[PDB]
């Protein structure tokens, strides 16, 4: 399950996943409707659902 970043996300709190617009993120736990958890650049962390889009 993959998504792609719609915007840069600059993390502010421990647990927040940093990424740039266009990056692909591997979704690991999307149980929360608001904040998904996944992996990018060799880290796990959480980020808002609405900062990404699902991809194929």
């Amino acid at each position: 399950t993959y998504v792609q970043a719609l915007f840069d996300f600059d993390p502010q709190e421990d647990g927040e996943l940093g990424f740039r617009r266009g990056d692909f993120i591997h979704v690991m736990d999307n149980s929360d409707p608001n904040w998904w958890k996944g992996a990018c650049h060799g880290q796990t962390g959480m980020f808002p659902r609405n900062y990404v889009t699902a991809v194929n």
Binding site: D32, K37, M46, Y51
Partner: peptide
């Protein structure tokens, strides 16, 4: 085009 507001009170670690 603008990034959405980030809603940290909704974070699942809270």
């Amino acid at each position: 085009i603008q990034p959405p507001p980030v809603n940290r009170n909704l974070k699942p670690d809270r």
